[PDB]
């Protein structure tokens, strides 16, 4: 018989790509959603091998118990749902607690009611490994060993810092659970940088603007006199992140590992240069800046050697990820 994979936050951008990939390899999927209609929409998109359960609040003890009890066929759990909204009334209630408590409660639910689950993957982030000023530093070398120094108290102050904290603390909690609770499953994490690339379904393009994907896609909203975007950092293609999740549960080597998913540096000029060459009909409708003035040669390469060895595949290049993302938006209008 077939294996079932559980995916929390099935509505999301990364989660959908993960689902499409997992389905392609012959797994069944069970997705968590915050509403019935949200589930129903996904079901129409993904078909018969996809099912959903409604889990409205992560941060309640036993939130996943019923859903797990309903799906004894599931032997893999991918916990991807997390807050990603930076502008909030209460950083704790809206960012920190759902990530941290929600993560702690999922793991406990799996141990309580899903002993059959062999593998759990937590979707972390580079923000778990760092602080904001570090990410942009040519002198900083991140690795799978890196942990953020941000305090919980500091993390509270505003939404961005809260997200950084939410990831670091939830991930630490996940590792702590494994140590303390001695579950049946092995844990692994995936720690991505900014995620670019096309959405899993064309139908989902119009609906919400994922904060990372929109960093690429927003270029289409520029006009000829606008400034070059100041957006900058490191990227990873969504399809690569999804493949990493697959590796994260499939490979023996992945057990107990953190995977740093990071490719190349970019800025707004890099982005503009790609789009203008690829979509030359847009050239007259976009700024030019200073083509190929971007220089990243000073930046020390991050140490992802272990992750790359474990994964064993090559990443999508920046132009490809960008072009694929734009082609989709154009197709849909
Ligand atoms: N994509 C990136 O650039 C990036 C970078 C670093 C790390 N990550 C990690 O990858 C995951 C996906 O990120 P994303 O960019 O795809 O964000 P996203 O598109 O907004 O996905 C977040 C999903 O999780 C659910 N969710 C959000 N906040 C929640 C809360 N407080 N309680 C319960 N459910 C909640 C939402 O479900 P509904 O649709 O039902 O609201 C949403 O579909 C994140 O958890 C993040 O930790 C992503």
TrEMBL record:
Domain named NAD-dependent epimerase/dehydratase: residues: 5-255
Protein name in UniProt: Protein induced by osmotic stress
Binding site for NADP(+): 11, 13-14, 34, 38, 80, 82, 163, 167, 195, 210, 212
Family, per entry: Belongs to the NAD(P)-dependent epimerase/dehydratase family. Dihydroflavonol-4-reductase subfamily.
Keyword Transferase: no
Source organism, top-level taxon: Eukaryota
Annotated source species: Scheffersomyces stipitis (strain ATCC 58785 / CBS 6054 / NBRC 10063 / NRRL Y-11545)
UniProt signal peptide: none
Keywords, comma-separated and alphabetical: Nucleotide-binding, Oxidoreductase
InterPro entries xrefs: Epimerase_deHydtase (IPR001509), NAD(P)-bd_dom_sf (IPR036291), NAD(P)_dehydrat-like (IPR050425)
GO molecular function: cinnamyl-alcohol dehydrogenase activity; nucleotide binding
Protein encoded by which gene: GRP3.1
First-level EC class: oxidoreductase
E.C. code: 1.1.1.195
């Amino acid at each position: 018989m077939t294996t079932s994979v559980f995916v929390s936050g099935a509505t999301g951008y990364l989660a959908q790509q993960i689902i499409a990939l997992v389905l392609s390899k012959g797994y069944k999927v069970v997705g968590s959603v915050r509403s019935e209609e949200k589930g129903a929409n996904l079901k129409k998109l993904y078909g018969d091998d996809f099912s959903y359960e409604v889990v409205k609040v992560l941060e309640q003890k036993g939130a996943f118990d019923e859903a797990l009890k309903k799906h004894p066929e599931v032997t893999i759990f991918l916990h991807t749902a997390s807050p990603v909204t930076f502008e909030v009334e209460d950083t704790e209630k809206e960012i920190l607690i759902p990530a941290i408590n929600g993560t702690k409660y999922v793991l406990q639910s799996i141990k309580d009611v899903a002993p059959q689950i062999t593998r759990v993957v937590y979707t972390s982030s580079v923000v778990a490994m760092s602080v904001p000023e570090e990410l942009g530093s040519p002198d900083v070398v991140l690795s799978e060993a890196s942990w953020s120094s941000l305090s919980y108290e500091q993390s509270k102050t505003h939404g961005v810092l809260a997200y950084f904290g939410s990831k670091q603390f939830a991930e630490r909690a996940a590792w702590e659970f494994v140590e303390q609770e001695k579950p049946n499953f092995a844990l692994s994490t995936v720690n991505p940088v900014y995620i670019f690339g096309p959405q899993a379904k064309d139908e989902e393009v119009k609906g919400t603007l994922n904060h990372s994907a929109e960093m690429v896609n927003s270029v289409l909203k520029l006009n000829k006199d606008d400034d070059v975007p100041a957006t900058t950092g490191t990227f990873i293609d969504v399809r690569d992140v999804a493949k990493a999740h697959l590796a994260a549960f499939e490979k023996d080597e992945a057990k107990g590992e953190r995977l740093l998913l990071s490719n190349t540096r970019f800025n707004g000029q890099t982005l503009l240069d790609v789009v203008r060459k690829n979509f030359p009909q847009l050239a007259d409708k976009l700024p030019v800046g200073k083509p190929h003035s971007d220089d990243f040669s000073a930046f020390k390469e991050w140490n992802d050697k272990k992750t790359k060895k474990i994964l064993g595949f090559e990443y999508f290049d920046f132009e490809t990820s960008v072009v694929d993302s734009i082609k989709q938006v154009l197709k849909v209008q």
